[PDB]
Short mmCIF file of C-alpha atoms in Angstrom, two decimals:
data_model
loop_
_atom_site.label_atom_id
_atom_site.label_comp_id
_atom_site.label_asym_id
_atom_site.label_seq_id
_atom_site.Cartn_x
_atom_site.Cartn_y
_atom_site.Cartn_z
CA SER A 1 21.33 8.86 -3.76
CA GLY A 2 20.03 7.18 -0.57
CA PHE A 3 19.27 4.07 -2.57
CA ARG A 4 22.97 3.88 -3.47
CA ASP A 5 23.74 3.63 0.26
CA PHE A 6 21.72 0.37 0.32
CA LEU A 7 24.44 -1.10 -1.93
CA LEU A 8 21.95 -2.35 -4.54
CA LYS A 9 23.19 -3.57 -7.87
CA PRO A 10 23.60 -0.74 -10.49
CA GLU A 11 20.94 -2.41 -12.55
CA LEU A 12 18.50 -1.91 -9.78
CA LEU A 13 19.64 1.66 -9.07
CA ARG A 14 19.02 2.59 -12.71
CA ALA A 15 15.41 1.12 -12.64
CA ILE A 16 14.74 2.97 -9.40
CA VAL A 17 15.81 6.19 -11.18
CA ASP A 18 13.57 5.43 -14.22
CA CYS A 19 10.67 4.90 -11.85
CA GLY A 20 11.00 8.50 -10.65
CA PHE A 21 11.96 7.83 -7.06
CA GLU A 22 14.42 10.22 -5.45
CA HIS A 23 15.14 8.82 -1.99
CA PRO A 24 14.12 5.77 0.06
CA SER A 25 10.94 5.84 2.14
CA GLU A 26 11.01 5.40 5.90
CA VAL A 27 9.90 1.85 5.65
CA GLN A 28 12.63 1.21 3.12
CA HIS A 29 15.32 2.59 5.41
CA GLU A 30 14.04 0.31 8.17
CA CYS A 31 13.69 -2.93 6.15
CA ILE A 32 15.85 -3.02 2.97
CA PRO A 33 19.35 -3.15 4.64
CA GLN A 34 18.44 -6.33 6.53
CA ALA A 35 16.16 -7.72 3.90
CA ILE A 36 19.00 -7.87 1.44
CA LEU A 37 21.09 -9.80 3.94
CA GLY A 38 18.47 -12.55 3.95
CA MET A 39 16.83 -11.68 7.26
CA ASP A 40 13.19 -12.57 7.75
CA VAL A 41 10.83 -9.54 7.77
CA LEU A 42 7.42 -8.88 9.27
CA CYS A 43 6.17 -5.48 8.08
CA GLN A 44 2.83 -3.66 8.40
CA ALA A 45 2.66 -0.47 6.43
CA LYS A 46 -0.17 1.31 4.78
CA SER A 47 -0.56 1.98 1.07
CA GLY A 48 1.83 4.47 -0.34
CA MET A 49 4.85 3.93 1.97
CA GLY A 50 7.14 1.96 -0.34
CA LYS A 51 6.32 -1.44 1.15
CA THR A 52 6.08 -3.39 -2.12
CA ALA A 53 9.44 -2.15 -3.28
CA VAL A 54 11.05 -3.49 -0.11
CA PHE A 55 10.52 -7.08 -1.13
CA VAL A 56 10.75 -6.56 -4.91
CA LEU A 57 14.16 -4.80 -4.56
CA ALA A 58 15.47 -7.07 -1.86
CA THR A 59 14.60 -10.29 -3.78
CA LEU A 60 15.98 -8.90 -7.08
CA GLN A 61 19.09 -7.90 -5.23
CA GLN A 62 19.67 -11.42 -4.08
CA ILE A 63 18.30 -13.52 -6.94
CA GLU A 64 20.66 -15.66 -8.99
CA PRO A 65 18.49 -16.94 -11.89
CA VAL A 66 18.74 -20.62 -12.82
CA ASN A 67 16.55 -21.82 -15.68
CA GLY A 68 14.00 -24.25 -14.57
CA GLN A 69 14.28 -23.06 -10.98
CA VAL A 70 11.69 -20.96 -9.20
CA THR A 71 13.77 -19.25 -6.51
CA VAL A 72 11.33 -16.45 -5.46
CA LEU A 73 7.70 -17.14 -4.59
CA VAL A 74 5.40 -14.28 -3.82
CA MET A 75 1.76 -14.87 -2.88
CA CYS A 76 -1.17 -12.66 -1.92
CA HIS A 77 -4.93 -12.90 -1.43
CA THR A 78 -6.33 -11.01 -4.34
CA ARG A 79 -5.95 -11.49 -8.19
CA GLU A 80 -5.54 -7.85 -8.75
CA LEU A 81 -2.67 -7.40 -6.23
CA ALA A 82 -0.95 -10.53 -7.65
CA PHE A 83 -1.13 -8.90 -11.08
CA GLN A 84 0.13 -5.56 -9.77
CA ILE A 85 3.04 -7.13 -7.86
CA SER A 86 4.09 -8.95 -11.08
CA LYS A 87 4.13 -5.59 -12.80
CA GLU A 88 6.33 -4.14 -10.07
CA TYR A 89 8.80 -6.92 -10.65
CA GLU A 90 8.82 -6.05 -14.32
CA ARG A 91 9.47 -2.35 -13.63
CA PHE A 92 12.31 -2.90 -11.25
CA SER A 93 13.96 -5.66 -13.33
CA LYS A 94 13.96 -3.39 -16.44
CA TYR A 95 17.77 -3.64 -16.53
CA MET A 96 17.99 -7.32 -15.42
CA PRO A 97 16.97 -9.20 -18.65
CA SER A 98 17.95 -12.64 -17.22
CA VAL A 99 15.11 -12.43 -14.65
CA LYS A 100 11.85 -14.03 -15.73
CA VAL A 101 8.56 -13.29 -13.81
CA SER A 102 5.29 -15.09 -14.25
CA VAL A 103 1.97 -14.66 -12.42
CA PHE A 104 -0.75 -17.21 -11.66
CA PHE A 105 -3.98 -16.14 -10.05
CA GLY A 106 -6.49 -18.15 -12.12
CA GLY A 107 -6.78 -15.88 -15.15
CA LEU A 108 -5.91 -18.79 -17.41
CA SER A 109 -6.91 -22.41 -17.12
CA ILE A 110 -4.75 -24.69 -15.08
CA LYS A 111 -3.59 -26.38 -18.32
CA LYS A 112 -2.67 -23.01 -19.89
CA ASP A 113 -0.76 -22.19 -16.67
CA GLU A 114 1.18 -25.42 -17.02
CA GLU A 115 2.11 -24.41 -20.62
CA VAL A 116 3.35 -21.05 -19.49
CA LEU A 117 5.44 -22.63 -16.68
CA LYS A 118 7.03 -25.17 -19.03
CA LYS A 119 7.71 -22.70 -21.84
CA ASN A 120 8.75 -19.60 -19.92
CA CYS A 121 10.47 -21.26 -16.85
CA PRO A 122 10.16 -18.19 -14.56
CA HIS A 123 12.58 -17.54 -11.70
CA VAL A 124 10.01 -15.38 -9.85
CA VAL A 125 6.53 -16.76 -9.47
CA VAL A 126 3.70 -14.53 -8.16
CA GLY A 127 0.25 -15.91 -7.52
CA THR A 128 -2.65 -16.73 -5.18
CA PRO A 129 -2.21 -19.77 -2.94
CA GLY A 130 -5.07 -21.83 -4.36
CA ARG A 131 -3.68 -21.79 -7.84
CA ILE A 132 -0.05 -22.10 -6.73
CA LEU A 133 -0.90 -25.24 -4.64
CA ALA A 134 -2.85 -26.83 -7.49
CA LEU A 135 -0.01 -26.19 -9.87
CA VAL A 136 2.58 -27.83 -7.56
CA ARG A 137 0.09 -30.69 -6.78
CA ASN A 138 -0.09 -31.43 -10.47
CA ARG A 139 3.77 -31.20 -10.72
CA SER A 140 3.61 -28.25 -13.12
CA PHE A 141 6.54 -26.78 -11.22
CA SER A 142 8.64 -27.54 -8.18
CA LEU A 143 8.99 -25.52 -5.00
CA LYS A 144 12.27 -27.34 -4.04
CA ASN A 145 14.50 -24.40 -5.08
CA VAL A 146 12.58 -21.54 -3.41
CA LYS A 147 14.99 -19.30 -1.54
CA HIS A 148 12.63 -16.30 -0.84
CA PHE A 149 9.06 -16.83 0.24
CA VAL A 150 6.98 -13.56 0.41
CA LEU A 151 3.37 -13.03 1.46
CA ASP A 152 1.54 -9.79 0.97
CA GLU A 153 -1.92 -9.02 2.35
CA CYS A 154 -0.67 -11.63 4.87
CA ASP A 155 -3.35 -10.92 7.45
CA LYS A 156 -6.05 -11.65 4.97
CA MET A 157 -4.29 -14.88 3.91
CA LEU A 158 -3.56 -16.23 7.44
CA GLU A 159 -6.88 -15.16 9.10
CA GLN A 160 -9.05 -17.21 6.65
CA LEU A 161 -8.30 -20.75 7.80
CA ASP A 162 -8.98 -21.98 4.36
CA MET A 163 -6.03 -20.06 2.92
CA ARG A 164 -3.86 -20.54 5.94
CA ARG A 165 -3.83 -24.30 5.38
CA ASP A 166 -2.92 -23.82 1.69
CA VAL A 167 -0.11 -21.40 2.65
CA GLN A 168 1.23 -23.93 5.15
CA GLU A 169 1.09 -26.76 2.57
CA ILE A 170 3.01 -24.62 0.13
CA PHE A 171 5.46 -23.54 2.80
CA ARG A 172 6.00 -27.22 3.65
CA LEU A 173 7.19 -27.99 0.08
CA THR A 174 9.86 -25.28 0.03
CA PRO A 175 13.38 -25.72 1.52
CA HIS A 176 13.70 -25.10 5.22
CA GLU A 177 16.67 -22.83 4.46
CA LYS A 178 14.95 -19.71 3.00
CA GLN A 179 14.17 -16.11 3.60
CA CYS A 180 10.59 -15.50 4.66
CA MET A 181 9.04 -11.99 4.48
CA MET A 182 5.42 -11.08 5.14
CA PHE A 183 3.75 -7.70 4.41
CA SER A 184 0.29 -6.35 4.99
CA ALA A 185 -1.48 -2.98 5.03
CA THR A 186 -2.98 -4.21 8.34
CA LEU A 187 -1.71 -6.62 11.01
CA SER A 188 -3.96 -7.16 14.03
CA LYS A 189 -2.24 -8.01 17.33
CA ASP A 190 -3.82 -11.52 17.16
CA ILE A 191 -2.41 -12.35 13.77
CA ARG A 192 1.27 -11.43 14.48
CA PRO A 193 2.03 -14.62 16.52
CA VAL A 194 0.81 -16.70 13.54
CA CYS A 195 3.08 -14.89 11.13
CA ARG A 196 6.01 -15.28 13.44
CA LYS A 197 5.74 -19.12 13.44
CA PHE A 198 6.85 -19.13 9.81
CA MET A 199 10.00 -17.00 10.52
CA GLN A 200 13.36 -17.05 12.33
CA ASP A 201 14.18 -13.98 14.51
CA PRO A 202 12.50 -11.57 12.04
CA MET A 203 12.88 -7.86 12.05
CA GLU A 204 9.53 -6.29 12.66
CA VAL A 205 8.02 -3.01 11.62
CA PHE A 206 4.45 -1.94 12.51
CA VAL A 207 3.75 1.56 11.14
CA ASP A 208 0.21 1.63 12.58
CA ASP A 209 1.42 1.04 16.12
CA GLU A 210 3.22 4.37 15.83
CA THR A 211 0.26 6.08 14.09
CA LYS A 212 -2.12 4.96 16.84
CA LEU A 213 0.17 6.66 19.38
CA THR A 214 0.57 10.04 17.64
CA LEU A 215 -3.23 10.14 16.81
CA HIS A 216 -3.98 11.95 20.14
CA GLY A 217 -1.92 14.83 18.89
CA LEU A 218 -4.01 15.14 15.69
CA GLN A 219 -6.82 17.76 15.66
CA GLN A 220 -9.83 15.79 14.43
CA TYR A 221 -13.22 17.25 13.62
CA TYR A 222 -16.44 16.09 11.85
CA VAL A 223 -19.12 17.99 10.06
CA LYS A 224 -22.67 16.82 9.71
CA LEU A 225 -23.50 17.33 6.06
CA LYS A 226 -25.68 15.50 3.61
CA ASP A 227 -24.07 15.12 0.18
CA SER A 228 -25.78 18.17 -1.27
CA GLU A 229 -24.20 20.38 1.40
CA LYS A 230 -20.66 18.99 1.13
CA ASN A 231 -19.28 21.25 -1.67
CA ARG A 232 -20.45 24.48 -0.18
CA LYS A 233 -18.99 23.67 3.27
CA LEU A 234 -15.82 22.34 1.61
CA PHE A 235 -15.38 25.43 -0.59
CA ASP A 236 -15.87 27.65 2.50
CA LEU A 237 -13.38 25.62 4.61
CA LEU A 238 -10.79 25.61 1.83
CA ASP A 239 -10.97 29.46 1.64
CA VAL A 240 -10.13 29.90 5.42
CA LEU A 241 -7.48 27.11 5.29
CA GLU A 242 -5.40 28.58 2.41
CA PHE A 243 -1.68 27.95 1.98
CA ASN A 244 -2.06 24.31 3.28
CA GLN A 245 -1.46 21.08 1.44
CA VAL A 246 -4.67 19.20 1.54
CA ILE A 247 -5.71 15.66 0.56
CA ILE A 248 -9.50 15.09 0.10
CA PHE A 249 -10.53 11.38 0.12
CA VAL A 250 -13.65 10.36 -1.80
CA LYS A 251 -15.24 6.95 -2.22
CA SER A 252 -15.12 6.48 -6.00
CA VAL A 253 -13.15 7.25 -9.18
CA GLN A 254 -15.87 9.45 -10.69
CA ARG A 255 -16.45 11.42 -7.46
CA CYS A 256 -12.62 11.94 -7.54
CA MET A 257 -12.49 13.38 -11.06
CA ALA A 258 -15.66 15.36 -10.62
CA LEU A 259 -14.78 16.98 -7.36
CA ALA A 260 -11.27 17.93 -8.61
CA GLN A 261 -12.84 19.46 -11.76
CA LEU A 262 -15.36 21.36 -9.72
CA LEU A 263 -12.60 22.59 -7.47
CA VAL A 264 -10.50 23.71 -10.43
CA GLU A 265 -13.56 25.52 -11.96
CA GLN A 266 -14.02 27.20 -8.50
CA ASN A 267 -10.45 28.41 -8.86
CA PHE A 268 -8.84 26.06 -6.38
CA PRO A 269 -5.37 24.44 -7.35
CA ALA A 270 -6.63 20.90 -7.21
CA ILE A 271 -5.67 17.69 -8.97
CA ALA A 272 -7.25 14.22 -9.12
CA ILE A 273 -5.38 10.90 -8.55
CA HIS A 274 -7.26 7.70 -8.35
CA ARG A 275 -6.08 4.13 -8.02
CA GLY A 276 -7.13 3.20 -11.62
CA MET A 277 -4.62 5.50 -13.29
CA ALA A 278 -1.36 4.14 -14.62
CA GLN A 279 1.79 4.51 -12.42
CA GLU A 280 3.40 6.98 -14.78
CA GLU A 281 0.37 9.23 -14.73
CA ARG A 282 -0.11 8.81 -10.89
CA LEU A 283 3.53 9.76 -10.54
CA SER A 284 3.35 12.85 -12.83
CA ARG A 285 0.26 14.16 -11.04
CA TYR A 286 1.64 13.41 -7.57
CA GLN A 287 4.84 15.36 -8.36
CA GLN A 288 2.70 18.44 -9.17
CA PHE A 289 1.02 18.16 -5.77
CA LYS A 290 4.18 17.48 -3.74
CA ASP A 291 6.61 19.85 -5.46
CA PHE A 292 4.95 22.39 -7.73
CA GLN A 293 1.60 24.03 -8.33
CA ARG A 294 -1.17 21.88 -6.83
CA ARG A 295 -2.17 22.33 -3.23
CA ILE A 296 -5.21 20.04 -3.14
CA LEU A 297 -5.18 16.35 -4.05
CA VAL A 298 -8.59 14.68 -4.58
CA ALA A 299 -7.96 10.95 -4.12
CA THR A 300 -9.48 7.51 -3.77
CA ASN A 301 -8.03 4.86 -1.45
CA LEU A 302 -4.87 3.30 -3.00
CA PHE A 303 -4.12 6.37 -5.18
CA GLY A 304 -0.49 6.18 -4.12
CA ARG A 305 0.08 2.42 -4.37
CA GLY A 306 3.65 1.65 -5.35
CA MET A 307 4.70 5.22 -4.53
CA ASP A 308 5.96 7.10 -1.41
CA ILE A 309 3.31 9.63 -0.29
CA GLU A 310 4.56 12.39 1.96
CA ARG A 311 2.67 13.96 4.82
CA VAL A 312 0.38 16.98 4.22
CA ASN A 313 -1.21 19.58 6.44
CA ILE A 314 -4.93 18.75 6.27
CA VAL A 315 -6.88 15.56 5.35
CA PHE A 316 -10.55 15.59 4.44
CA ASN A 317 -12.84 12.50 4.52
CA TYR A 318 -15.22 13.98 2.05
CA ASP A 319 -16.80 10.53 1.90
CA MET A 320 -16.71 8.55 5.03
CA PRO A 321 -14.06 5.82 5.05
CA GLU A 322 -15.43 2.35 4.93
CA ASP A 323 -14.01 1.24 8.29
CA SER A 324 -11.66 2.38 11.12
CA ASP A 325 -8.50 0.99 9.58
CA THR A 326 -9.23 3.14 6.55
CA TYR A 327 -9.89 6.22 8.64
CA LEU A 328 -6.59 5.64 10.45
CA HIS A 329 -4.62 5.23 7.22
CA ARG A 330 -6.21 8.29 5.61
CA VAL A 331 -5.70 10.69 8.46
CA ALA A 332 -2.25 9.46 9.36
CA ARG A 333 -0.81 11.68 6.68
CA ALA A 334 -2.25 14.83 8.33
CA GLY A 335 0.53 16.85 10.02
CA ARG A 336 3.82 17.59 8.34
CA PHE A 337 6.96 16.85 10.40
CA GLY A 338 6.99 18.78 13.66
CA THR A 339 3.75 20.67 12.90
CA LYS A 340 0.13 20.32 13.78
CA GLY A 341 -2.21 18.33 11.66
CA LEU A 342 -5.92 18.80 10.92
CA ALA A 343 -8.47 16.08 9.94
CA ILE A 344 -12.05 16.91 8.93
CA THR A 345 -14.60 14.14 8.32
CA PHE A 346 -17.95 14.63 6.63
CA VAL A 347 -20.62 12.62 8.29
CA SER A 348 -23.70 12.30 5.98
CA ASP A 349 -25.84 9.40 7.45
CA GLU A 350 -26.08 7.13 10.47
CA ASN A 351 -23.74 4.52 9.06
CA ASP A 352 -21.10 7.24 8.75
CA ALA A 353 -21.66 8.08 12.45
CA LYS A 354 -21.26 4.46 13.35
CA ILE A 355 -17.81 4.31 11.77
CA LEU A 356 -16.73 7.53 13.53
CA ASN A 357 -17.76 6.00 16.76
CA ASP A 358 -15.73 2.79 16.18
CA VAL A 359 -12.88 5.08 15.28
CA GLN A 360 -13.05 7.02 18.52
CA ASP A 361 -13.62 3.82 20.44
CA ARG A 362 -10.81 1.83 19.00
CA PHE A 363 -8.06 4.50 18.98
CA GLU A 364 -9.26 6.34 22.19
CA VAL A 365 -9.52 9.80 20.56
CA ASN A 366 -12.19 12.53 20.31
CA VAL A 367 -13.48 13.59 16.88
CA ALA A 368 -15.18 16.92 17.87
CA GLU A 369 -18.05 18.50 15.96
CA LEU A 370 -16.58 21.34 13.98
CA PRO A 371 -17.38 24.78 15.41
CA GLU A 372 -19.38 27.46 13.58
CA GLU A 373 -17.22 30.54 14.26
CA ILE A 374 -13.72 31.75 13.32
CA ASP A 375 -11.02 29.06 13.13
CA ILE A 376 -8.81 30.61 15.84
#
């Protein structure tokens, strides 16, 4: 419905349907209308906000495939994200058979990559900058037809001066007349001027800037609990906080499955989603949480990659987040629109307490020690 208002090709609309998406995310409303007009884009958005689909959809909307011509180049820092982005291109081009996507992150030898490039002639190339640069240096393909140049994890790529030089050398070999879009889950204030030097009057979106402002309105508590005390305290808190939608973040896939199982055995309506599950399964489980029976989602980081995860009432850090960016991104979903949110963090050791202090220091908020009397 709302995607139709973007004026996307019917082939893209049909693929968006098949992917189970109902309406555009907030980041998509902000970015897609101008991205499909060729405007440069600088966008920071955390996982699970529809960020990847902004550039996949906008570049597929504009692409005019010519055999032998790479017209879309997408690069990122990690092999796994390059692989996952290539799969997102496959899902959204389901009804665009003329579009060919290939990915190059080092999984094959450089000679095998050269063979794939010459045989398959992709119009969309995804990869990491080291391998892309080596392939162009060896004349395995040409960058002279690139019309869309996209970076993801762009802060990782441009911080590391090694990769920044490779990115610039690749940028130099593309036409000056091109659309440039850069995405990242995090964008420090220091890295934004660097990104801007590659662009022309870009539209800019920084989700975390807004999240850092609303954070003072979020009720945030911690509980000092070693591991062996976490379940009893959690079970007790979940009893008093009934009729709320809750996400519980844990640090690993097996802790995710086990906690959700223990919760279900304890008669809580919980479901597990971790970042290793396939998209179709993550979507199916997430629909149960957002629309139907499940009130508690046990999750790892990145459980909602490629999806649009709505706000909830309460967020638990059952296991401490690894840094303060991760804390911010986890608790940002606490508080449904126009209501009060609650974040509760389990602190088990001194390293945990260190992170909580960096959190309170960086975002200028107080994470109070949770009381031990009635919650009103």
